């Protein structure tokens with residue numbers, strides 16, 4: 001029933017402004033950490049993302065509190081989730097470490113103040129130049145993803161006369177051969193470790209795995225960790241060593257739909273099937289069957305920042321399209337609202353069928369009582385938001401007007417670096433709400449100069 | 462049969478180097494317009510795209526030759542397809558016009574030397590600043606996509622005392638109301654045109670439509686053009702005017718799979734179901750039932766550049782993954798080849814299930830006789846190429862080695878502006894082969910400075 005769907009969506013809306021730790025209402029507008037988002041979107045050109053340092057901190061608290069039963073836990077934010085420097089700075093100041101996924105990610109983590117001993121460098125393609133940069137900067141871990149790459153680590157560590165600290169990525173078969181490009185097979189772990197021990201400037205620290213992203217059950221983490229723990233225990237015996245650590249990766253999910261009573265996480269993984277506590281319980285229980293003193297490294301990405309941003313986008317056009325029958329009578333009307341952000345700004349809404357709550361931030365206390373379709377500004381028929389409240393339809397106040405600010409919630413993970421300049425619309429500015437509730441610009445909107453500065457061409461003037 | 466699939470793929474490979482107007486072989490390597498692509502990829506860092514000015518010119522020839530039966534045809538390259546300045550310059554020097562999809566696209570077309578009278582500006586969200594820039598620059602056409610936008614065109618043209626030349630976009634119901642965000646309903650065309658005629662600084666030039674992209678049959682173009690032609694004829698009568706033009710949009714498909722005897726274009730639109738001649742026959746036949754003298758405007762994007770680039774990417778790692786049964790016996794092996802381009806470089810291979818021919822450019826004369834899986838360098842389990850020769854599997858020479866150059870063909874449409882800095886891997890350089898067969902860099906690879914120059918942060922040194 002649409003009425004029931006509409007009723008439920010407006011219960012969720014009221015819970016946003018009366019129940020959510022992030023949000024309030026003022027002057028009829030959605031507020032984030034006490035910042036009126038309508039007013040903010042009159043101060044900065046839309047579309048833009050606004051991050052909350054307070055919410056990042058709360059998310060980091062949930063993660064670390066979840067691991068209270070294991071004191072030697074080291075937490076590395078997976079920076080492919082978001083690497084805007086001011087976001088990395090908030091995460092650094094909140095007291096955790098960083099995982100990096102390219103040479104330039106390593107460099108920006110170092111620049112913003114993560115020490116080498118606070119950085120893990122992972123990857124399936126770590127070219128000699130990448131490895132040389134990482135080894136020269138004394139990173140806490142460089143993962144070993146393949147035997148081919150390991151030969152470069154040996155050669156380059158010898159060349160620099162600097163120890164490379166490594167963890168061997170093993171991807172358990174919980175078809176992994178066909179569908180998992182990353183890591184070594186379990187069967188290869190022993191000889192790989194044996195070979196690293198013999199290398200003069202490579203130091204074996206432990207094994208690594210990463211299950212995946214937005215994982216809706218605890219069992220995959222428990223099963224995969226058990227495989228890694230059993231192999232770690234066995235190799236300690238066979239090789240006569242004591243591992244420094246085990247790195248169990250990331251994948252803690254974030255709620256993108258909150259009404260769990262109406263959702264099946266295994267069918268719709270926008271429902272978060274598990275909590276950080278569930279992830280920690282599964283991991284710690286398995287590790288403690290082997291050692292309670294070993295360091296556990298975790299690599300959460302999405303959970304750190306996902307809930308901690310909103311995309312603000314201005315309703316910039318409207319139209320009504322009407323389907324008529326062959327006698328000219330109306331079959332239905334469609335109310336299109338156009339916002340100034342499309343899939344070049346919010347990639348996952350299109351490419352990964354990702355749901356984000358959508359509300360009229362300018363009319364946040366008004367009933368969202370009109371079915372509408374929400375379109376982006378790209379000259380591209382597929383640039384509209386398909387992941388609606390009911391099918392492809394969204395709910396906004398019937399009073400919605402051009403000039404209102406629409407907010408997409410839970411827009412803090414995998415939303416910035418994935419933007420494009422398709423249609424030569426610019427990638428967005430980014431604003432940060434700091435711990436004091438003050439705002440500042442932390443990324444500019446791309447300028448026209450940015451569209452062409454990369455190009456090499458004969459000028460005309 | 463895999464053997465048969467392998468046989469057919471190697472027949473296609475031989476046709477590339479012995480039959481294709483674009484390619485040859487030399488020193489065992491794939492050549493493009495006589496340029497050895499292995500050698501080129503030792504001169505420039507991979508991954509990068511290489512465009513062919515000769516092939517752009519050939520594609521433009523096919524389009525214009527297709528319209529020989531209609532002398533007053535004006536051709537506007539849809540620049541959302543590719544707007545690297547050197548690519549736009551080649552298209553300008555080849556003698557056609559430009560369609561633009563944002564304020565900055567308009568600006569870059571003007572900068573590279575398209576005159577205002579050679580530019581069409583389309584869009585669903587043309588804000589006042591966008592319209593003011595377009596009207597001030599005397600564009601040949603600004604489309605009218607909605608009644609809301611039309612009010613801004615009236616007001617701003619009055620403010621500047623400059624005539625805005627417009628075409629009214631009408632999207633026929635050939636559900637269009639639910640699935641087509643663009644244009645007005647046919648039922649709205651009459652009053653919209655009547656209102657424009659009464660505006661002092663808005664000049665109505667005709668109607669506009671655009672069917673879509675990679676369209677595999679001629680019927681949609683014929684049917685939609687007929688609707689637009691019938692309404693144009695009727696409005697000339699009702700309103701007592703003579704239209705300058707009709708703008709029928711783009712959508713000419715490009716072959717991404719060439720063995721048409723084995724493909725159904727309506728099921729797999731990588732097979733191009735129609736040619737430019739088929740598009741022109743359908744459009745011209747319908748227009749000439751109304752007027753033979755009127756100007757026909759077309760907006761091809763993909764067809765201009767799609768076949769005119771190759772992505773060159775270096776095999777940068779390899780591994781074998783083996784699935785074992787519960788007794789330790791081998792069930793299967795998977796041979797993974799890792800290249801230095803993933804979906805942040807070649808977006809559509811992931812997000813739009815787009816097929817591109819893949820060959821070992823370094824071993825182009827060798828039998829491609831080994832099934833492999835082809836992975837990108839992103840730390841992301843989904844970053845491998847799923848659109849294989851058979852399922853998710855590709856064919857490369859069993860002799861393929863790290864350091865070989867892999868080529869993706871037909872990589873010239875919608876491949877540059879759609880790149881991202883996900884994982885802070887840079888967006889690629891772009892090279893151009895000019896009409897003389899010489900090469901030059903036309904876009905640099907993003908530098909590390911580019912990763913962070915947009916960010917605003919307190920430095921440490």
Ligand SMILES: [Cl-]
Nearest residue numbers: 074075096097
């Ligand atoms: Cl930590």
Ligand SMILES: [Cl-]
Nearest residue numbers: 318319320608
């Ligand atoms: Cl309307």
Ligand SMILES: [Cl-]
Nearest residue numbers: 535536557558
């Ligand atoms: Cl022309």
Ligand SMILES: [Cl-]
Nearest residue numbers: 147779780781
């Ligand atoms: Cl291997």
Ligand code: NA
Nearest residue numbers: 041045046314
């Ligand atoms: Na705005």
Ligand code: NA
Nearest residue numbers: 196197199202
């Ligand atoms: Na060693």
Ligand code: NA
Nearest residue numbers: 502506507775
């Ligand atoms: Na290279």
Ligand code: NA
Nearest residue numbers: 657658660663
């Ligand atoms: Na007029």
